[PDB]
Amino acid sequence: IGTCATMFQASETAVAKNQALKEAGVFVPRSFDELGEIIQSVYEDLVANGVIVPAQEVPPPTVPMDYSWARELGLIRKP
Amino acid sequence: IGTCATMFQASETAVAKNQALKEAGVFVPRSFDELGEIIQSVYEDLVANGVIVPAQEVPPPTVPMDYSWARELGLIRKP
Secondary structure: OOHHHOOOOHHHOHHHHHHHHHOOOOOOOOOHHHHHHHHHHHHHHHHOOOOOOOOOOOOOOOOOEEHHHHOOOOOEEOO | OOHHHOOOOHHHOHHHHHHHHHOOOOOOOOOHHHHHHHHHHHHHHHHOOOOOOOOOOOOOOOOOEEHHHHOOOOOEEOO
16 A cells, blocks of 8 residues: 555655566556455456365354444434 | 134135135135235236336335344343
C-alpha cells in the first residue's frame, strides 16, 4: 500500500517495490482495485488444473449472541 | 376436516359434505394432502389467463425483537 505517497530512499518506495515484485515473478495487480480480480483469476486456474480439491461446506453449530453485543447493534429492544 | 370420524345425521358428515361441495362446483381436493397442490394448480391457471397481476415484492421496515420473546427462543444469552 502507498504508491501515491510520492504524489503529495528511492528503492524503498511502494511504486518501485511493487514493480520489482512484478518483474521477479509475483502476481501483482496493476493497482489495489484489481486485487480481488487477480486473486480470483489465480484461484480459477488453480481449480481448473486439478491442483485444489475444494471442501464441501457444512453448516456450523450456532451460539446465541451476547446480549451486551446484540444490544449495541440494535437487534434487542427492552425498556 | 374429519372424514374419518365415521371410521372409529347422515348429510352432516364430512365425507358427504365434501362430496356435495365437489358435485356443485367447488374445487375440492381428494383429501387434505392435495390441498396445497389444488390451490397451486388453481393459482397457476389464474396467472396464465391475465386475471391476477402479481405484486412486486418489496422488503419491509424492520423492528428489533422483543427481549422477553427472543430470550425464550434462545437467541440471547446473558448471565
